[PDB]
Task: structure prediction
Amino acid sequence: SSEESQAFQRQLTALIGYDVTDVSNVHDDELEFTRRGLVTPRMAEVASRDPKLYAMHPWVTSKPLPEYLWKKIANNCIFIVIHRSTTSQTIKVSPDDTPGAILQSFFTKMEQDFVLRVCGRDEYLVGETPIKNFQWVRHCLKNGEEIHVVLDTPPDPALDEVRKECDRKFRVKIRGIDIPVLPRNTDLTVFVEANIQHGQQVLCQRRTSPKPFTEEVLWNVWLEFSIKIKDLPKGALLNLQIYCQLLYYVNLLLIDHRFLLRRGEYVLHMWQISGFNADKLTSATNPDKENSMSISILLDNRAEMPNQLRKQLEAIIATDPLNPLTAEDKELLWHFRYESLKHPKAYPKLFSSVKWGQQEIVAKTYQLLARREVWDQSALDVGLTMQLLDCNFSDENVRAIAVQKLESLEDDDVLHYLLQLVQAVKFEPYHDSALARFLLKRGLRNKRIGHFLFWFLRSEIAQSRHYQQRFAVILEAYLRGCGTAMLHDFTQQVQVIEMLQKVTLDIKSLSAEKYDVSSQVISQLKQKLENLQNSQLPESFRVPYDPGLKAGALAIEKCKVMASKKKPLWLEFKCADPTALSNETIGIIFKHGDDLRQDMLILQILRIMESIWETESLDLCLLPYGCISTGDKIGMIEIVKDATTIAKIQQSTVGNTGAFKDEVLNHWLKEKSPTEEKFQAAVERFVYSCAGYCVATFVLGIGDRHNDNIMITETGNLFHIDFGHIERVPFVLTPDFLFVMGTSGKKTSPHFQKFQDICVKAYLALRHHTNLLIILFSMMLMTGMPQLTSKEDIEYIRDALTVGKNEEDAKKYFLDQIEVCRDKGWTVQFNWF
Ligand SMILES: CNC(=O)c1nc(-c2ccc(Cl)c(S(=O)(=O)Nc3cccc(F)c3F)c2)cnc1N
Result:
């Protein structure tokens, strides 16, 4: 430790937003043991990575180029437009043409160190991929637009340079509980419930005598459990809870990171229930020693299946993730564990049929996992892998075969799944996990991944006390290997975000909950932005939410505070790239008031749904806008260009306190389209994007939305906003949407029939991926909600995806829902005030 060493570590702390060397809220070694453990995987990935592919991070896919999109290539021909200083020049090109081939199919069209970069962006077309297999290229095809690439020097890889670095039964003594003040109620009773717990399966449970609820309550009882010390499984948690009814909980790992039984005296500060949630499982103690309840404790311690059994089995094995097993189901899985091993899809259920509190069963479990050829030969099924990483599996061997599968994800697919894999770190018993390290590896290997990993981790560190220490240790590890270049770049973004976040807080307080932005507010705002430009603010920052774009200077006069109780800022920037082919603006909405973690989670489910749709050649035209959560009820949102809310459209030549008429959306649509062509391209886009959002939202159960929360672009693209947030309609298909499709008001249309057609296609696309959608929704709820039912809330999607139907029963169902919305026209829209 020099200065040096510590100098650098001070930078890290501000990048993270947490001090990982602080050891004042720990009662053991684990965290520091993870900092040192993560050194090896990091270095291995630094040492092993390609310097120039790392510096240029092509964003590519191995996936087939969809039916739509080929249908946008005419004569096996793709036009690319190079640029050198003031010169341009197109180049006709073939789908399979590697960027190296294209570059010389240009030098022959009349040295080595020139790269095919994108205009506007830190985005290279490089490495050995058919151009059609770069994502920027596919963005340009889907979107009707031309590919523009500058010709310049390949970024110096030197900038990315990484810095030099017993058969006794188990018992617990419950000494007592202490809390500086209760005043919440007068009196009542309290007991401590101590649960021995594995994969949220309670192994044993004892409680204390009840006693009067006073500021200090002492017991001081040995609670003897039914289980032997030797049958405690690794990852087993002492769960300690205070009831009246549940008020407080905390957990202690019975077995530690060094495989030793937790021995000794503990005073543990607890988390308060504020009224099935990832938070409940944390091995972290509450850092607030002042206001917190504490508890103190001492630890002193080959055959042939009856054709119809086999079909019993296969029916169990073919049932959904949320289908409960019975004692019988479990005994059948376990008894026929080797038969079950032949089915990859049985793995979750088979592992839930294990008695984890028996050492000899656990051992037999390990013996069957040594026999892992069927699993290792199986194609990655992400949904099934995801299930083994959720709250029901606390065993490291089980969780580690799940991660093993994830190893073959391409980078493109990591990115689809990144937020939910970061969130899944919360179901890990230990800080250092095969999952922790896979995310670490994948981040260091790819800058795009590594950038989102930063903000994903940072979002949790800034607002999860339960989980911020774990996530900070993993973030530090990332940061000590991403390169001083990336480090430089994160520092800047944090700098800007902090600056811009003060301004949105300051400005909010100034405005009352009254629907008016006062002269002197927009005055106050314009002021700070100048008083900040113009100080203060970096010459240019990378847009988080979109790491290719770089923002430069604000456009003070386009900036404003938004017609919302939340008073978000609407900021606009000049794009610091001269080579950019527009002068369109980079818009970021900063907002305090909403939990944008919920938005993130939903938005990422929606990108996934679009990939599901792509595999079956459907484009439902979602606009899943960028949205980075930054701290407690605060963060950033992407401004969609030429977009207007659907409430604002209705409050037209009409006006305010009334009333909703069925055209207007159509007029606005023609009003906005320069040619009757463009109009029709818009009505088309509307039928698709409409369909996508009705399926998506019905499945996620977030369909009943008010139309100030539904937007549309000038080109017909519908999109829901503010997921926020939190008589029944299944989705928002109002008369004004129908008109545009062309069916006032109980008939059929060429375009309604199409809409109905597209919904049915896309719905059925999703149910093919039913098990994947269900695990995502279930983790979503556990790691990003208020409270959620370990039956009914999660089970919504089961019923939405119409599990255990044929394609017929389902098409019916969805067309039924389409109707409910038509039968109710404007009811629920009006029902708002
Ligand atoms: C009026 N809003 C817009 O024009 C707009 N809104 C968004 C947007 C997307 C998601 C969310 Cl969650 C939001 S917001 O609810 O936080 N901001 C907002 C502020 C004033 C009025 C609104 F209707 C808003 F949605 C806004 C994106 N691009 C846009 N062009």
Remarks:
- The longest strand covers residues 216-228.
- The radius of gyration is 29 Å.
- Residues 562-564, 568, 589, 591, 625, 637, 639-640, 643, 645, 708, 721-722 surround O92 (CB under 6 Å).
- The chain is about 40% helix and 15% strand.
